[PDB]
Structure formats: C-alpha cells, structure tokens
Design a protein around this ligand. Structure first.
Ligand SMILES: NC(=O)c1ccc[n+]([C@@H]2O[C@H](COP(=O)([O-])OP(=O)(O)OC[C@H]3O[C@@H](n4cnc5c(N)ncnc54)[C@H](OP(=O)(O)O)[C@@H]3O)[C@@H](O)[C@H]2O)c1
Ligand SMILES: O=C(O)COc1cc(F)ccc1C(=O)NCc1cccc(C(=O)O)c1
Length: 316
C-alpha cells in the first residue's frame, strides 16, 4: 500500500488524511499538530466548519518548526453553498487561504452541488423553513473553480456530494478546461457506493470517503441508529487481524483505491488511525464488509430535498 494516489492533475494525494468537521476550535490546533507529528500529511478542511483559522495555526507552526515542508502537505478545503456565484468564488477561496495561512490549496472542492442565496447565513431560510436557492448552476460554478487554478490559488479542483449525473454534467461541460480531480462522498460499510465509485474511477476521478467511521459525533445522531464501531461483525474482523475496529474501517476504503479522512481530536486515536499501513484485509474480508451496505447516510442533506440540484434523489 503506497501512501499517495496519483490525481489527474499530475499531483500525488496522501490516501489518509485528518478530518476536521466538529473538531472544536480549542482542540483542533493540537489535533492537527499531533497528526503532523505522527505522520499525517493531508488535512481535510472547510470554511463551513468554522475552524480553519485554528487549523491554520497548527499548519503554520509545523512549517515554522520544520517538521514538514509545504510541498509535503496536501491541504484540502471546500467552497460553501452560499458562494456559488461567479463573483464570490475567488473571495471565498481567499478567505480560506488567509485563515489557513497558506498561499495555495492542494485541492479545492465544490462542497455540495446545491447553491444557496448569498449572505451571512450558511443556510438561508424562507419564512417557512426551506433553504433559499441561488440560480447559479453547477457548470458556471465549475468555470469559476477553473479560474482559481489559472490564478495559482489552488493546484487541483474537485467536487463533493455529486451524484453520477452531476459528475457527468461537468465532464460533458462545453469548453471544459480541467476535469474534477476528486469527488468526496460519504462511504463506509453501511453506504458502500459501488456504482458511484466505479463511475468516478472509470473517468479517472479519485474518490475520497468521508465519515468512514459512521460519524458517531454527528449532531443529529439518534440512539437507535446503526453503529459501525460497535458492529460485532466488524469487531470480529478487527480481532482476527489484531487491529481496532476503527483501523479496519480506515483500511477498507484504502483497499478500494479510495482516499479516507477519519476525524479525531483525541491524540491517541489520531495516532492509532494512522497505523493502517501494516496489515491487509483479504478479498473475502473486503467482500464481507461490502455486504453490510444498507444505504444509510450520515449526511442526507434533508433540508435541501426540493433544491433542483439535490444530489440524493438519483440512485447514484
Ligand atoms: N464533504 C462533505 O460533505 C463532508 C461531510 C462529512 C464529513 N466530511 C469530512 O470527513 C471527515 C470525517 O467524517 P466525520 O467527521 O463525519 O466522522 P468520522 O471520521 O466517521 O468519525 C469521527 C468520530 O469518530 C471518533 N473516532 C475517531 N477515531 C476513533 C477511534 N480510533 N476509535 C473510536 N472513535 C474514534 C471521533 O471521536 P474524537 O474526535 O472524540 O476522537 C469522532 O466522534 C470530517 O471531519 C470532514 O473532514 C466531509
Ligand atoms: O457538509 C459537511 O461537510 C458536513 O455537514 C455539515 C458541516 C457543517 F459544518 C455545517 C453543516 C453541515 C451540513 O448540514 N451538511 C449537510 C448539507
């Protein structure tokens, strides 16, 4: 298992990264410092997570300490839904760069295919609770992303939570200049994503698996929801390999040629989650884990279900 995967922009992306959604601002600086100290070279960020300033403090300190060089890091962020308009994309990217204290991103993603009305609120609502869309379309937002490459702000551009017809819309865009390098999607044994993964990989688009542990800290969790980390069948596979359940859940996407971005703020877990390059799941293990699919989504975008670009009506 090599540590990096080749993207269709010619750059190499570390297959293991640190997630930062829900990482409290008063803990994420230490989390990222520890991660870099124990070998992580890829951090997954987003403006909407409201902690990029604190992530940036950690990155900058480790660069200043010469623990790593900038070229060895792979920093990812995402354009939030209220910035899909042509005239807002550059400023949104620049705010993320300023907060992360970087002069380029390795990868910048359209966070969701749905554009929302610009303004201070990340989820602008009408008086009856529906998200207010913007009349921007995917293709014009993509052209704005391409301009970021040509201005030197980002090395690669990609998409997140795009279904296969939305990916196809970009691939078929008139005048397409840069293909998406990555589609970042939810993926784990309860949402195995075979169809969308095969489609993206067949087009040379690398898939990143988010919520690989089932996001046990997601704010809308209910006690009755399935729990990957507690699933006795997954625990049994981990026991057989003398690894933790989380380690199996991280190794699983790696062996499907995916990038994976588990989140933790706990130093011991940050280190544990990186120790996944020393064992192999068998083909039988892989097929058994795939068999647990139940089309269960952590991130269903349930308040956007009437948006014209809502991604999860299509089968994939
Ligand atoms: N593009 C998108 O729309 C999108 C959506 C969702 C997520 N993401 C990205 O993907 C990242 C990962 O997904 P996620 O944050 O939803 O959840 P996740 O990585 O599946 O799970 C994170 C949770 O697992 C716990 N955990 C981590 N390592 C563990 C271990 N070894 N043993 C036991 N528990 C462990 C963490 O606890 P502690 O932190 O307390 O240790 C935290 O509660 C996000 O942070 C974000 O960067 C992107
Ligand atoms: O969209 C992600 O990356 C993870 O979900 C979030 C994260 C936030 F910080 C704020 C809102 C969401 C959210 O509701 N998304 C689902 C649309």
């Amino acid at each position: 298992m090599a540590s990096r995967i080749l993207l269709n922009n010619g750059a190499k992306m570390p297959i293991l990264g640190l997630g930062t959604w829900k990482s409290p601002p008063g803990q994420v600086t230490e989390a990222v410092k520890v991660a870099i100290d124990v070998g992580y070279r890829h951090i997954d960020c987003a403006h909407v997570y409201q902690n990029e300033n604190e992530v940036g403090v950690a990155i900058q300190e480790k660069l200043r300490e010469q623990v790593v060089k900038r070229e060895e890091l792979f920093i990812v962020s995402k354009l939030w839904c209220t910035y899909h308009e042509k005239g807002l994309v550059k400023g949104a990217c620049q705010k993320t760069l300023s907060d992360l204290k970087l002069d380029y991103l390795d990868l910048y993603l359209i966070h969701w295919p749905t554009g929302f009305k610009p303004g201070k609120e990340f989820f602008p609502l009408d008086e009856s609770g529906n998200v207010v869309p913007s009349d921007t379309n995917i293709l014009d937002t993509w052209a704005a992303m391409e301009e970021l490459v040509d201005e030197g702000l980002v090395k690669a551009i990609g998409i997140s939570n795009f279904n296969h017809l939305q990916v196809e819309m970009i691939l078929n865009k008139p005048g397409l200049k840069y293909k998406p390098a990555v589609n970042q999607i939810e993926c784990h044994p309860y949402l195995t994503q075979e169809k969308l993964i095969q489609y993206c990989q067949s087009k040379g688009i690398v898939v990143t698996a988010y919520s690989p542990l089932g996001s046990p800290d997601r704010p809308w969790a209910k006690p009755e929801d399935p729990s990957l980390l507690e699933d006795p069948r997954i625990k049994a596979i981990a026991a057989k390999h003398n690894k933790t359940t989380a380690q199996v859940l991280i190794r699983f996407p790696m062996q499907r040629n995916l990038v994976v971005i588990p989140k933790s703020v706990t130093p011991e877990r940050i280190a544990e989650n990186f120790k996944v390059f020393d064992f192999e799941l068998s083909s039988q293990d892989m097929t058994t884990l795939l068999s647990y699919n139940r089309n269960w989504r952590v991130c269903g975008a349930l308040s956007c279900t009437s948006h014209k670009d809502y991604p999860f009506h299509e089968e994939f």
